[PDB]
Amino acid sequence: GSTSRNFSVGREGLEYVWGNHEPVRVWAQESAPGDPHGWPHEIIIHYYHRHP
Amino acid sequence: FEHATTVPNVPGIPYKALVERAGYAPLNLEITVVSSELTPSTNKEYVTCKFHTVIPSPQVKCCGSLECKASSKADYTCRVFGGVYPFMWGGAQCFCDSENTQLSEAYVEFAPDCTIDHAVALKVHTAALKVGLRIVYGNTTAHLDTFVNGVTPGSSRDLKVIAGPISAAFSPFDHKVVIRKGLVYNYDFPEYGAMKPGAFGDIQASSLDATDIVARTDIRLLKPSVKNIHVPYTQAVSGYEMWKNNSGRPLQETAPFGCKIEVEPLRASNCAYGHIPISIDIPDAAFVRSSESPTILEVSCTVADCIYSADFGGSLTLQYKADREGHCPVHSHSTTAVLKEATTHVTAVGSITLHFSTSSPQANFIVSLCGKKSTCNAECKPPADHIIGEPHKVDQEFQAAVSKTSWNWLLALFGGASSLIVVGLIVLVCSSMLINTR
Amino acid sequence: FEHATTVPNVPGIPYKALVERAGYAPLNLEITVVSSELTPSTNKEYVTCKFHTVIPSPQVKCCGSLECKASSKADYTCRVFGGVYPFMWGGAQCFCDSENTQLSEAYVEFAPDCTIDHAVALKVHTAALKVGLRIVYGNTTAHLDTFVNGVTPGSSRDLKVIAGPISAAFSPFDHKVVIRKGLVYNYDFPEYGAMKPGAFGDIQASSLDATDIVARTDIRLLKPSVKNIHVPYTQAVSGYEMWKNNSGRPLQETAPFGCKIEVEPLRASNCAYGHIPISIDIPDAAFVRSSESPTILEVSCTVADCIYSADFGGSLTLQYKADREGHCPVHSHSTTAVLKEATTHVTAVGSITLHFSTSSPQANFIVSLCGKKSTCNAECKPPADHIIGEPHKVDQEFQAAVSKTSWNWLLALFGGASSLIVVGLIVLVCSSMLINTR
Numbered sequence: 001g002s003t004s005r006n007f008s009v010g011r012e013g014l015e016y017v018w019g020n021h022e023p024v025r026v027w028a029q030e031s032a033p034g035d036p037h038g039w040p041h042e043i044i045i046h047y048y049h050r051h052p
Numbered sequence: 053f054e055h056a057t058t059v060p061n062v063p064g065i066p067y068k069a070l071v072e073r074a075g076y077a078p079l080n081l082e083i084t085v086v087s088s089e090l091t092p093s094t095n096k097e098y099v100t101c102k103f104h105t106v107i108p109s110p111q112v113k114c115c116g117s118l119e120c121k122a123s124s125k126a127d128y129t130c131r132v133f134g135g136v137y138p139f140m141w142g143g144a145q146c147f148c149d150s151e152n153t154q155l156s157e158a159y160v161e162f163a164p165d166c167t168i169d170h171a172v173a174l175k176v177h178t179a180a181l182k183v184g185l186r187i188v189y190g191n192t193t194a195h196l197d198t199f200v201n202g203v204t205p206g207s208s209r210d211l212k213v214i215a216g217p218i219s220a221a222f223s224p225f226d227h228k229v230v231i232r233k234g235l236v237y238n239y240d241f242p243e244y245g246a247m248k249p250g251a252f253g254d255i256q257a258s259s260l261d262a263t264d265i266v267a268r269t270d271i272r273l274l275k276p277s278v279k280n281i282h283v284p285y286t287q288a289v290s291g292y293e294m295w296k297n298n299s300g301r302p303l304q305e306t307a308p309f310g311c312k313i314e315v316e317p318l319r320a321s322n323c324a325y326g327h328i329p330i331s332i333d334i335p336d337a338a339f340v341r342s343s344e345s346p347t348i349l350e351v352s353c354t355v356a357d358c359i360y361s362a363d364f365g366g367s368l369t370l371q372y373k374a375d376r377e378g379h380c381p382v383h384s385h386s387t388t389a390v391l392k393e394a395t396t397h398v399t400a401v402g403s404i405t406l407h408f409s410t411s412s413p414q415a416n417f418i419v420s421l422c423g424k425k426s427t428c429n430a431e432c433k434p435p436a437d438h439i440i441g442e443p444h445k446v447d448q449e450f451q452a453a454v455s456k457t458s459w460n461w462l463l464a465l466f467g468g469a470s471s472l473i474v475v476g477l478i479v480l481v482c483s484s485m486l487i488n489t490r
Numbered sequence: 491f492e493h494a495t496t497v498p499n500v501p502g503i504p505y506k507a508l509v510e511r512a513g514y515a516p517l518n519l520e521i522t523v524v525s526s527e528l529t530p531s532t533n534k535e536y537v538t539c540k541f542h543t544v545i546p547s548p549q550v551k552c553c554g555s556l557e558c559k560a561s562s563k564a565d566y567t568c569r570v571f572g573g574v575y576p577f578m579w580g581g582a583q584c585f586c587d588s589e590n591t592q593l594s595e596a597y598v599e600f601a602p603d604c605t606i607d608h609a610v611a612l613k614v615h616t617a618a619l620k621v622g623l624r625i626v627y628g629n630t631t632a633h634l635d636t637f638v639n640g641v642t643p644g645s646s647r648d649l650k651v652i653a654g655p656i657s658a659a660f661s662p663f664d665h666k667v668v669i670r671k672g673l674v675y676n677y678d679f680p681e682y683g684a685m686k687p688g689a690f691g692d693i694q695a696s697s698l699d700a701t702d703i704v705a706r707t708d709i710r711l712l713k714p715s716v717k718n719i720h721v722p723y724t725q726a727v728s729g730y731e732m733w734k735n736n737s738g739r740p741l742q743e744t745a746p747f748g749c750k751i752e753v754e755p756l757r758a759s760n761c762a763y764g765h766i767p768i769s770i771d772i773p774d775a776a777f778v779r780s781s782e783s784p785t786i787l788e789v790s791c792t793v794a795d796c797i798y799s800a801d802f803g804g805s806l807t808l809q810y811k812a813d814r815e816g817h818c819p820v821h822s823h824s825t826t827a828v829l830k831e832a833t834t835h836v837t838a839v840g841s842i843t844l845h846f847s848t849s850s851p852q853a854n855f856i857v858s859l860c861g862k863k864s865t866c867n868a869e870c871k872p873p874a875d876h877i878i879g880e881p882h883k884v885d886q887e888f889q890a891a892v893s894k895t896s897w898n899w900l901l902a903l904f905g906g907a908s909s910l911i912v913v914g915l916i917v918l919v920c921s922s923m924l925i926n927t928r
């Protein structure tokens with residue numbers, strides 16, 4: 001039908017092959033919500049969404 | 053001379069480095085793998101496919117008795133009967149009543165269409181690796197391919213490259229593996245001679261045009277129950293077809309590390325693991341002595357902005373003052389920072405702009421021009437988009453991955469927790485010694 | 491009916507055994523390994539032999555200049571010259587005094603005798619054993635050939651024998667191995683691409699009629715001096731004939747455990763090590779009733795003479811009574827004795843002889859006769875001559891190897907010393923805590 005499937009990429013990559021199409025590579029980059037540059041109520045947010 | 057360097061094993065992304073001799077100008081050196089094939093050692097056991105149950109014509113002796121002989125064809129089967137009385141389209145084909153004995157017979161061989169969709173079964177031992185390099189030094193590009201074992205010289209146009217042995221030793225191919233029609237499944241087939249009625253390895257032969265076919269397919273016969281002539285046989289279902297229905301996924305969507313499986317030499321080409329410790333023998337013709345390369349008199353780095361990510365996010369600026377209008381090799385001497393441009397034309401005075409890509413929030417790396425060093429230092433922001441379509445160029449390494457203000461706000465706390473107790477202990481022993489005069 | 495048995499893997503000598511069932515008569519069973527063939531799974535790597543330096547005719551350009559390209563033949567080597575003036579039989583082959591060049595190229599290929607005189611390098615691993623058997627039970631022989639992995643069955647005329655795994659596994663080969671004219675050596679050759687000039691392996695090819703011939707053999711040209719035209723060169727010694735000088739002994743007279751080593755499939759046939767367990771599915775139609783066999787009482791041995799050698803030197807007699815004639819099996823139920831008759835003829839009240847062998851100087855073993863245990867003791871003596879030409883039958887067992895005289899002197903001495911310290915200890919403790927009263 002007309003569906004949608006979540007997945008989970010890593011640091012090293014993820015490829016998925018939809019049918020007869022060519023495989024497409026996807027990498028993720030460290031985009032934690034915050035900033036590692038001050039106000040210590042907030043440094044422990046950026047270093048928690050990566051490596052909790 | 054020869055310069056040792058461990059290039060990482062990721063296909064496509066180059067690993068820049070520069071070499072240094074005394075009295076000679078420095079020379080850049082770009083190393084990149086472009087395609088790497090992984091080929092194992094192949095031992096073939098047999099070939100199986102769908103069978104074809106042949107029944108030769110029923111031998112009938114009128115007014116006598118029979119008993120079999122021995123043969124060697126696959127699943128040879130004898131069962132004489134007693135007191136038969138057959139019937140053709142002309143009724144009463146035989147004459148002598150109540151003791152006619154017929155001889156049934158059954159055996160098997162391959163299907164006629166077995167040449168296309170047979171399933172070769174193999175055995176794999178201790179694969180070896182072959183990488184395709186691409187070396188660019190001093191505007192002289194050299195193509196070559198070499199073996200990865202540390203004694204095999206891959207030579208190409210006066211440039212001897214001895215790739216040493218890789219660290220990790222594995223393959224996606226386990227010990228037993230079948231192959232049909234290009235699709236590489238992965239399966240623990242029965243060893244040769246050991247049939248099973250109703251599973252893979254049901255009918256085995258060392259070649260498809262052979263005559264030493266062996267089989268054990270559980271053919272039990274029946275006594276003929278209707279007046280006409282036939283041969284009532286029953287046989288178990290084919291192990292190849294019922295294996296094919298329950299085959300599972302092939303190796304092309306289960307093999308780790310991104311390996312693409314080519315089938316015709318059974319290779320596992322173009323995937324990424326470990327490091328490749330190589331060494332490049334630079335020829336002595338690409339070296340001009342240091343009196344002729346224009347030396348730079350002072351440099352001072354200053355960066356502009358960062359986005360530490362996969363792509364070339366950070367921008368760089370050196371401000372120099374040089375001697376003449378020649379060239380300069382450019383290399384950053386870190387392991388978390390890599391530069392886009394490798395050489396730049398120089399002026400007696402002028403500026404420059406470079407590009408780097410890093411993964412740490414502080415850019416405290418060292419950038420070398422022709423001869424001198426100048427430390428760059430600023431802080432760098434995380435990226436905005438969560439997913440990018442190209443892989444990272446340097447690693448994470450978890451020492452400089454933590455920020456500077458995080459260390460300056462935690463190491464003060466740990467240093468205070470140590471300082472309060474060492475002050476408490478020294479004033480304890482001082483007070484006890486000062487009262488201890490009595 | 492299953493019957494587990496661990497026969498010793500040494501060819502030629504049989505292995506006496508009785509099977510037994512309740513309500514039936516027991517019957518003999520002997521299992522000899524008539525032949526065995528230990529074949530490994532191997533992998534061809536390259537064919538090498540003595541090379542042949544071809545030198546094509548030199549190219550001279552009259553009053554000009556030349557340079558060499560890159561070729562791909564086996565060890566191509568070119569370098570130009572200048573200032574020549576070559577002479578043929580009719581001289582003056584150019585027309586300017588020392589302003590011209592000549593070319594000089596050289597390469598190798600195979601000899602026209604390497605189709606008989608080559609040396610096929612291989613790479614063996616994981617040898618898997620095969621055994622030809624000879625089963626005979628109740629004067630009915632059978633010949634079987636089976637694999638000695640614990641799955642693959644061996645079937646011949648309503649008799650199914652499955653051989654268990656090996657006790658301890660080895661193959662007499664190393665990992666790398668080479669072959670020429672049937673003589674299997676044992677060498678660690680340089681692999682494909684890693685040629686050194688002057689050892690075994692400086693010619694590499696897929697097959698001998700292939701084209702991808704790769705080679706390095708230290709061929710360096712020299713400058714000609716004489717006015718006549720030729721090309722001088724120099725080259726290292728052929729490493730194939732240097733290997734052939736001091737190759738060593740072949741492995742047909744260096745392999746342990748004593749086995750003929752065939753070549754054309756690379757067998758390691760017919761040597762003897764360990765024990766292999768089998769289990770024989772005897773058909774129940776080949777049995778006889780216990781209401782049919784001659785039942786006996788009054789069984790007692792009488793030993794004529796004993797000698798512990800590897801022939802059938804010890805003689806032995808029996809006394810019996812029976813109630814009807816026929817055949818009955820004979821068997822010794824020890825591990826230090828075998829018979830040499832497996833069936834005998836029994837009369838009503840008679841008495842017969844036998845022959846045995848032993849490796850123990852104290853023959854205390856239990857013979858059987860038609861299913862009736864009877865112990866009979868004997869005493870033996872060392873042999874006369876001490877080298878024969880037929881292998882031993884029985885191992886040493888470490889406890890029947892010492893005689894009863896050695897044990898009773900030894901343990902009488904130990905019992906004297908132990909009884910002495912125990913009587914001293916008990917007198918010490920009881921007299922102490924009897925005298926200490928007050």
Ligand SMILES: *[C@@H]1O[C@H](CO)[C@@H](O)[C@H](O)[C@H]1NC(C)=O
Pocket residue numbers: 190191379
């Ligand atoms: C190529 O390299 C040589 C040697 O360093 C240099 O002199 C030349 O300028 C380079 N070519 C270009 C186009 O810069």
Ligand SMILES: *[C@@H]1O[C@H](CO)[C@@H](O)[C@H](O)[C@H]1NC(C)=O
Pocket residue numbers: 628629817
């Ligand atoms: C073979 O054995 C059977 C019983 O085991 C016996 O009756 C027969 O006489 C034997 N054959 C010969 C030739 O003696």
